[PDB]
Ligand binder design. Structure first.
Ligand SMILES: *[C@@H]1O[C@H](CO)[C@@H](O[C@@H]2O[C@H](CO)[C@@H](O)[C@H](O)[C@H]2NC(C)=O)[C@H](O)[C@H]1NC(C)=O
Ligand SMILES: *[C@@H]1O[C@H](CO)[C@@H](O[C@@H]2O[C@H](CO)[C@@H](O)[C@H](O)[C@H]2NC(C)=O)[C@H](O)[C@H]1NC(C)=O
Ligand SMILES: *[C@@H]1O[C@H](CO)[C@@H](O)[C@H](O)[C@H]1NC(C)=O
Ligand SMILES: *[C@@H]1O[C@H](CO)[C@@H](O)[C@H](O)[C@H]1NC(C)=O
Ligand SMILES: *[C@@H]1O[C@H](CO)[C@@H](O)[C@H](O)[C@H]1NC(C)=O
Ligand SMILES: *[C@@H]1O[C@H](CO)[C@@H](O)[C@H](O)[C@H]1NC(C)=O
Length: 1324
């Protein structure tokens, strides 16, 4: 008879012990020894990697566990060989292939949110656990990818402490929207986790559109309620425009227009016949509704999908035994419900379900269609348990009920020659780890000593023998997430009677964590404490706390039991046996290879509050104090704990804290107001109680504004107003406020309810009328010479006659470094916006140059280093937006017709220079270089297919020379990645063009810089020729290029600054310092109050030049005592500059007098820059003044209408040919906003940016043909006595080519139109 039944799983997994079940039956000779070995057939040879051996006794089902394969093993040809021998005979010796499973460890990536906004911090944790949820100490590499698959930021060789790595990643202001990715590279495997980044637009008001998802054709009443409500809680009293349309292409797809007043939330009861007509299983009905408030002009839309059930009743079959074993009892829990969701018990029971049983013998013999009437229970799962005849092959159950006469067919007859069958079954549902569960073994014949075996995650985790038909098993963590219990025994004839039950085992963790809130309900901005109680000391805990609104989207970025189950389900993988009609199939159904001599025959943006990460040491209980955020929400806290001994443990339930207040105050402030205007502060009191309350709103009296409410009551000045707030919102109390002082003003509104009180303080910026003008004058106190111990300079400025009194502001700064002022103003070097492609580099390349200068000078502080690198990463993230699909970079990304070689070269050079500091994706560099090198002509000339944005390089005459000289310099930094960049023909072309004769200063400067960078022998001649054209004046060298359309200003042209910077770089690259110093002196004295130069490009080039050249100066000691005494500073203001405060920008606010003047007296050694900054506002503003642009703003708006102001801005460029990229800044009138997508992008308007009451239009180019753009603005705040706003168009790369005009609406709100109908409020 049979003697052995050695069974092994068919898979191999690194890090998992291979266990082999050995059963020696009764008719076995003696104690055998079973050896097992894992052979690796990598090459043609076979290497016995692992092996095990054991002596097993007769009549005992035991296990043989191999040593675990090392976790770093790769996919090889693995073959498990088992050989069992006794004192003489070898009973069996066989081998089989093992399928390789690459899921070795469990890696969880936990981001605090699934959906992110721009300017948000992605906080992410990485948890690395073994298959048994113990911490896995390893060195992982973290990578972050944007949706275009660009390496944004990586961390390398991160050593995980108890398997947990906590990190943060700062998103930029304008990232690439889409699905980002986090990749964790443990060993040779990579684990992914995507988080979505999407832009957030203010929804204004929301619509709910509640409808039942599953309805029935026979349901008379169907209603869809649409709840329109403003964000402040007030319902919208608007007329819904509704379209109730199907997607049934065979139908008409007409829309029933139930367009009337919603009145907050109305009923929309429908008719059955009407819906039959509209229909004439459907495509789901799409409900689309829209409310449009007339004044705002804003409309919100929602799509709601409504599927359809055929009948009023729904009968569904599940939990059915997929194997039809004759002489056994079929069982299936069949649910009865109704499309409305209300079973209604007796009322819809209507007596019995016949549950027609169709038994068939599958002939072409025993054909029975008998029906058994059974009553419907209240639960609906009647769980019929009818028997099966001895030869029934096919079963069809047809439950005939009043609705949904559903059918089910099962066709799988288990084949057994002896007609012997068993069946493993379970009654329990909550099958957990450590909790025993019962198993019942039904059988149609005599049952012998059963033998069970459990397979889980492709590993044989338990064996044994049971002598009874009812036995209990206790799962362990290895059994999860889905065990497979195979019960079998062997009859006398060597037939294996067996059955499989697949049991979902719930996972219970030994490690336990409990979170407790101090208070279940707390007020906002209250200090509560979160209490963490863990099992054992030396545990690392990660706790997240998020708004209750989350999880309605089923966010996958959290360590919850669902995510743990999903992770564990990746272990349980393998081919599944569709058929189970034989014992061999029964064994194989859970991946088992059986070696036996028996007859085995083949046949929605949720904000985050707490991101706590604490390494609890000796403590098993720790309390952390936190502040409840101001918003009225509900915060649920969840967390995990990891310890070395017990492993992982999750919180069973999230614990909730309700942030509740009796009422809440909302203020609606205009952000900016001009001095002299009178705005209307509206305060809204959202009342959350269930009964009307009488709140009392008070504004704290301040000297920086006057409230115009001349109250009727005596004593009280009208700063207080009492009102009755009904339940659930309703208050819009208005205070007319006239600011008096300028700057930032705080307004503090305090509401005193009888029960509670609250206060809200908000800041309003009050500016001065007119256009803001600036002046800056710098001097370099070059006290290095010992003879020049004392130095006296004078800085003067005379205000224009049309200055706005009170808007003047004079200050003076001193700093002890040549590149000083650029250090402080790294965050913002220029006042222009940088939403375009090239301009964004103004927050990137200067960081490179400052870090290079400070590292060379050995003065780089850690804090400044980290700030600079953070700016570098933000600049890189923002810049990668403007990369086109063909690898190019353009000024406006993919909106441009084609990329620009000039800007691609600029970005390539900057990224190559930023390699040693931050991490740049090399694929971006490779694609950019590949795109560039296709544009080199036969003679070496580079040409730019992109749109001209810099008229000097790209446009004008000598364009090929400047483009070649720029791109040749930019490509040299790529010689690291490719030592054979063939630019010798380009160099020869530049040399020939230089020998031709260069007249312009800018072209010659670029030629000199190119020839110096490539070390061409003509470079010395070019630089000598460029120097001799300079202006030697006052120990300074500079180049002045004349133009008759530049507004007079302190600052020179961008072209002149670039010329000086390139000449200085040429002097540096040729190792000529003494004759380069004057250019350094001049270049250092032409910066603005922010430490930057005029435009973006000139600023980057000049900062590069000053960083490269200032590093060669000797400033080892500097001790300067600057004294500032003059008419504008009566008291002598003294700045001390030492070797410690070298980079400190020492500032002092001077008085305002006409004319401003200061004498600066300095004594000592070293370099010091002293700068006088004046900021003022001229009153008002083509004509005889020097303006390159002719601008005209015509405000056309009806006098009767006070809410809409449409202005037509017509501009033209009276200059040589076309201009470069231009910027139009439209300042809106106080209390006016331009709705989004109001200005359509066109061939001219390339980008519209909506700042706070300001529009930045990036015009492509302006020429002599008049270009007119319409700006429609809609009132959102009531502001009386509005002051004139301004429209200013400038050339981006030459700000002195500018034109500014003033405008104002011809109709104004009066002083007392601000007040509402409230009593006691009398401004007129
Ligand atoms: C290049 O720069 C030099 C130096 O500023 C310019 O030379 C000056 O040109 C102006 C206007 O023609 C004269 O009034 C000065 O006397 C010149 N100063 C010199 C030669 O030292 C030169 O014009 C510039 N060239 C171009 C093409 O812009
Ligand atoms: C600032 O400097 C100016 C010029 O260097 C000084 O003006 C001279 O002052 C002296 C003495 O006060 C007079 O004798 C001269 O006639 C002045 N010349 C001019 C052109 O004004 C001025 O006094 C200095 N102011 C301070 C406060 O030191
Ligand atoms: C599993 O394998 C590891 C390493 O191969 C070994 O240390 C351990 O003892 C094995 N487990 C059993 C139960 O033999
Ligand atoms: C096992 O080995 C025997 C003897 O070499 C062979 O007859 C049989 O086909 C092998 N495979 C099995 C039993 O699956
Ligand atoms: C099967 O059902 C029949 C009839 O309901 C019952 O007599 C018998 O005991 C049942 N057997 C099992 C194993 O459920
Ligand atoms: C001005 O630019 C517009 C827009 O491209 C073009 O249609 C027109 O021909 C240009 N006119 C001149 C004189 O350059």
């Amino acid at each position: 008879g049979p003697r052995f039944l050695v069974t092994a799983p068919g898979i191999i997994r690194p890090g998992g012990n291979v266990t082999i079940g050995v059963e020696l039956l009764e008719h076995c000779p003696s104690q055998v020894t079973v050896k097992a070995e894992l052979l690796k057939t990598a090459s043609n040879l076979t290497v016995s990697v692992l092996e095990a051996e054991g002596v097993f006794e007769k009549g005992s089902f035991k296990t043989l566990t191999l040593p675990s394969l090392p976790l770093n093993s790769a996919d090889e040809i693995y073959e498990l060989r088992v050989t069992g021998r006794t004192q003489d005979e070898i009973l069996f010796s066989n081998s089989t292939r093992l399928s390789f499973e690459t899921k070795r460890i469990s890696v969880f990536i936990q981001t605090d949110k699934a959906l992110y906004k721009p300017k948000q911090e992605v906080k992410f944790r990485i948890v690395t656990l073994f298959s048994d949820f113990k911490p896995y100490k390893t060195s992982l590499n973290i990578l972050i990818k944007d949706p275009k698959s660009n390496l944004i930021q990586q961390w390398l060789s991160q050593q995980s402490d108890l398997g947990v790595i906590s990190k943060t990643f700062q998103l930029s202001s304008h990232p690439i929207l889409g699905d980002w990715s986090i990749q964790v590279q443990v060993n040779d495997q990579t684990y992914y986790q995507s988080f979505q980044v999407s832009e957030y637009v203010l929804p204004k008001f929301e619509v709910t559109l509640q409808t039942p998802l599953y309805c029935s054709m026979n349901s008379k009443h169907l209603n869809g309620t649409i709840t329109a409500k403003y964000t402040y809680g007030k319902p919208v009293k608007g007329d819904v425009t509704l379209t109730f349309l199907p997607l049934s292409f065979w139908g008409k797809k007409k829309n029933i227009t139930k367009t009337f007043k919603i009145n907050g939330s109305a009923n929309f009861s429908f008719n059955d016949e009407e819906m039959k007509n509209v229909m004439d299983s459907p495509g789901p009905v799409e409900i689309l509704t829209t409310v449009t408030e007339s004044v705002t002009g804003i409309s919100r839309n929602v799509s709601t999908n409504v599927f359809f059930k055929q009948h009023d009743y729904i009968i569904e079959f599940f939990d059915y035994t997929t194997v039809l074993k004759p002489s056994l009892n079929f069982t299936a829990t069949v649910k009865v419900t109704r499309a409305d969701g209300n079973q209604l018990t007796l009322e819809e029971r209507r007596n019995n379900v016949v549950i027609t049983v169709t038994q068939r013998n599958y002939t072409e013999k025993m054909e029975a269609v008998q029906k058994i009437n059974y009553t419907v229970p209240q639960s609906g799962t009647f769980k019929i348990e009818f028997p099966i005849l001895e030869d029934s092959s096919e079963l069809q159950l047809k439950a005939y009920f009043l609705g949904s006469k559903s059918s089910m067919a099962v066709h799988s007859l288990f084949k057994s020659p002896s007609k012997t069958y068993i069946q493993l079954k379970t009654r329990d549902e909550n099958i957990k780890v450590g909790s025993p569960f019962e198993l019942v073994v039904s059988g149609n014949k005599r049952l012998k000593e059963l033998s069970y075996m459990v397979v889980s995650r492709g590993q044989l985790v338990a064996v044994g023998k049971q002598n009874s038909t009812m036995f209990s098993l206790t799962p362990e963590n290895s059994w999860t997430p889905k065990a497979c219990v195979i019960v079998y025994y062997i009859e006398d004839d060597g037939e294996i009677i067996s059955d499989v039950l697949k049991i979902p085992v719930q996972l219970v963790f030994k490690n336990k964590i409990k979170l407790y809130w101090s208070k279940v309900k707390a007020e906002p901005s209250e200090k509560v404490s979160l209490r963490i109680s863990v099992t054992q000391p030396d545990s690392i805990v990660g706790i997240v706390a998020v708004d209750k609104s989350v999880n309605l989207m089923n966010a996958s970025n959290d360590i919850t039991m669902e995510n743990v189950v999903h992770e564990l389900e990746l272990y349980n993988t393998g081919y599944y046996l569709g058929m189970f009609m034989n014992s061999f199939a029964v064994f194989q159904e859970c991946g088992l290879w059986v070696l036996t001599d028996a007859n085995l025959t083949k046949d929605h943006f949720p904000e985050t509050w707490i991101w706590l990460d604490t390494n609890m040491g000796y403590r098993i209980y720790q309390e952390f104090e936190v502040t409840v955020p101001d918003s009225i929400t509900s915060w649920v806290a969840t967390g995990f704990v990891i310890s070395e001994d017990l492993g992982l443990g999750l919180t069973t339930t999230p614990v909730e804290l309700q942030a509740f207040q009796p009422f809440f105050i909302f203020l609606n402030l205009p952000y900016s107001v001009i001095r002299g205007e009178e705005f209307a502060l509206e305060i809204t009191i959202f009342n959350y109680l269930k009964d009307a309350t009488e709140v009392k709103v008070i504004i704290e009296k301040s000297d920086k504004f006057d409230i115009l409410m001349t109250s009727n009551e005596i004593n009280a000045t009208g700063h207080q107003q009492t009102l009755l707030v009904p339940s659930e919102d309703g208050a819009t109390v208005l205070f007319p406020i006239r600011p008096t002082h300028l700057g930032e003003i705080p307004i503090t509104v305090t509401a005193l309810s009888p029960t509670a009180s609250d206060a809200v303080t908000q800041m309003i910026l009050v500016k001065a009328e007119g256009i803001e003008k600036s002046y800056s004058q710098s001097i370099l106190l070059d006290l290095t010479d010992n003879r020049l111990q004392s130095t006296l300079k004078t800085l003067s400025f005379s205000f224009p006659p049309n200055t706005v009194t009170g808007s003047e502001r004079v200050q003076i700064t001193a700093i002890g470094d040549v590149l000083g002022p650029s250090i402080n103003g790294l965050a913002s070097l220029i006042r222009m916006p940088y939403g375009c492609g090239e301009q964004n580099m103004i927050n990137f390349a200067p960081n490179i140059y400052i870090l290079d200068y400070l590292t060379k000078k050995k003065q780089l502080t850690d804090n400044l280093k980290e700030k600079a690198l953070s700016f570098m990463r933000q600049g890189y993230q923002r810049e990668l937006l403007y990369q086109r699909e063909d690898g190019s970079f353009s000024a406006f990304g993919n909106y441009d017709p084609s990329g620009s070689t000039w800007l691609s070269a600029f970005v390539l050079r900057c990224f190559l220079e930023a390699d040693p500091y931050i991490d740049i994706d090399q694929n971006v560099l490779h694609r950019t270089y590949t795109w560039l090198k296709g544009h080199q002509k036969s003679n070496g000339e580079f040409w730019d297919p992109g749109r001209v944005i810099h008229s000097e390089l790209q446009g004008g005459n000598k364009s090929p020379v400047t483009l070649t000289a720029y791109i040749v310099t930019s490509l040299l930094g790529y010689r690291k990645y490719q030592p054979n960049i063939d630019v010798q023909e380009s160099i020869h072309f530049l040399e020939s063009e230089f020998s031709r004769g260069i007249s312009d200063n800018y072209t010659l400067a670029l030629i000199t810089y190119a020839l110096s960078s490539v070390g061409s022998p003509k470079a010395k001649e070019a630089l000598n020729m460029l120097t001799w054209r300079a202006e030697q004046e006052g120990g300074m060298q500079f180049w002045v290029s004349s133009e008759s359309k530049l507004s007079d200003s302190w600052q020179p042209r961008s072209l002149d600054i670039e010329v000086a910077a390139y000449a200085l770089l040429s002097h540096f690259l040729q190792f000529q310092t003494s004759e380069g110093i004057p250019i350094m002196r001049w270049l250092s004295r032409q910066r603005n109050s922010l430490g930057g130069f005029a435009s973006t490009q000139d600023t980057t080039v000049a900062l590069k030049a000053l960083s490269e050249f200032a590093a060669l100066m000797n400033t080892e000691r500097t001790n300067i005592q600057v004294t500032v005494t003059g008419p504008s500073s009566p008291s002598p203001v003294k700045f001390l500059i030492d070797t410690h405060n070298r980079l400190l920008l020492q500032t002092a606010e001077l008085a305002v007098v006409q004319p401003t003047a200061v004498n600066i007296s300095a004594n000592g050694f070293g370099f010091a820059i002293c700068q006088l900054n004046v900021v003022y506002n001229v009153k008002a503003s083509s004509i005889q003044n020097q303006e390159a642009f002719d601008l005209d703003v015509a405000v056309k708006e009806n006098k009767d209408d006070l809410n809409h102001v449409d202005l037509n801005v017509c501009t033209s460029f009276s200059g040589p040919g076309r201009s470069g990229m231009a910027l139009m800044e439209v300042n809106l009138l106080s209390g006016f906003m331009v709705p989004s997508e109001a200005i359509s992008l066109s061939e001219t308007v390339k980008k519209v940016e909506y700042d706070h009451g300001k529009l930045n239009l990036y015009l492509d180019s302006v020429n002599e043909t008049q270009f007119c753009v319409n700006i429609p603005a809609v009132r959102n705040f009531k502001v009386s006595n509005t002051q004139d706003a301004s429209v200013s168009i400038v050339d981006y790369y030459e700000p002195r080519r500018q034109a500014v005009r003033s405008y104002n609406s011809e109709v104004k709100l009066s002083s007392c139109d601000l007040c509402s109908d409230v009593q006691g409020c009398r401004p007129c």
